[PDB]
Amino acid sequence: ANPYERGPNPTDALLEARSGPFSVSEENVSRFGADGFGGGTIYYPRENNTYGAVAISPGYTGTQASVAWLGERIASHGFVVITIDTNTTLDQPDSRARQLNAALDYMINDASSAVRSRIDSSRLAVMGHSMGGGGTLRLASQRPDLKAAIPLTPWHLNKNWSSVRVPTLIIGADLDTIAPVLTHARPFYNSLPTSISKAYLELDGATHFAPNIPNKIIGKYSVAWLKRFVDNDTRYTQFLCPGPRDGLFGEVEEYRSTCPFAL
Ligand SMILES: [Cl-]
Ligand SMILES: [Cl-]
Numbered sequence: 001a002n003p004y005e006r007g008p009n010p011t012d013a014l015l016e017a018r019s020g021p022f023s024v025s026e027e028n029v030s031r032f033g034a035d036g037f038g039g040g041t042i043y044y045p046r047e048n049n050t051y052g053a054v055a056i057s058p059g060y061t062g063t064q065a066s067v068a069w070l071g072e073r074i075a076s077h078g079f080v081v082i083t084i085d086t087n088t089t090l091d092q093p094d095s096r097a098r099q100l101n102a103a104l105d106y107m108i109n110d111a112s113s114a115v116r117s118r119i120d121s122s123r124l125a126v127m128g129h130s131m132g133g134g135g136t137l138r139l140a141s142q143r144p145d146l147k148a149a150i151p152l153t154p155w156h157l158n159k160n161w162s163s164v165r166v167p168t169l170i171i172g173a174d175l176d177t178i179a180p181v182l183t184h185a186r187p188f189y190n191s192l193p194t195s196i197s198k199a200y201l202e203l204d205g206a207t208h209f210a211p212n213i214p215n216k217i218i219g220k221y222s223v224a225w226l227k228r229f230v231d232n233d234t235r236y237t238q239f240l241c242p243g244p245r246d247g248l249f250g251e252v253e254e255y256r257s258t259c260p261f262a263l
């Protein structure tokens with residue numbers, strides 16, 4: 001048993017649905033209301049409880065709209081989630097890392113009392129697309145207290161993430177020509193320590209922009225990872241260990257992990 005558990009006992013179908021069981025409210029954060037980042041939208045459960053909190057960054061030239069579906073879907077499973085805009089859409093990964101940090105702090109300290117009262121500030125995670133995924137890796141390396149990190153088709157010039165101790169799921173796309181998995185996602189995964197909880201899910205038949213529209217697989221494994229690591233929710237281990245089979249056409253190219261994952 002576990003005091004951080006929220007929602008019903010899961011199934012694959014529950015994780016694959018357009019919405020989880022929680023009712024999602026939205027709070028707008030304008031550019032000038034956000035100290036240290038470009039604003040965003042906070043998605044949060046209307047059900048009064050405390051939940052973990054997650055910040056999600058888009059990539060270069062991207063806005064919060066490119067990750068909105070995923071922020072809302074995650075929130076609907078019982079999380080407080082901010083999808084950010086960056087100070088400029090030209091910001092590099094290490095700047096996005098600090099803006100993700102600022103967005104976590106915003107949710108904890110600067111958002112409405114409705115949002116702040118629903119956050120367990122000790123249980124935080126970060127995610128991001130492309131350069132936002134590079135920023136996710138950088139922030140994970142700077143903040144070992146984070147509970148989870150999910151880089152989506154990540155891009156970063158630094159290939160060595162051996163300092164990261166945060167449970168990290170990297171999602172790559174086999175056809176990606178912008179952040180090719182051979183030179184980005186795979187080197188990142190291979191450099192993460194063998195001794196941390198980590199997984200690499202490479203989508204088959206998928207482009208760099210697979211994370212930017214509703215995707216059953218990305219939603220399912222993102223939610224399961226956050227449940228397992230932000231909530232310590234062992235009801236979600238079954239989806240992650242051993243995880244999906246390799247070689248599923250148009251779905252999963254491969255799934256690697258360090259299963260079993262320690263609490
Ligand atoms: Cl990018
Ligand atoms: Cl592509």
Ligand SMILES: [Cl-]
Pocket residue numbers: 186190
């Ligand atoms: Cl590899």
Ligand SMILES: [Mg+2]
Pocket residue numbers: 023024025
């Ligand atoms: Mg709603």
Ligand SMILES: [Mg+2]
Pocket residue numbers: 030031032033034035036037038039
């Ligand atoms: Mg601002």
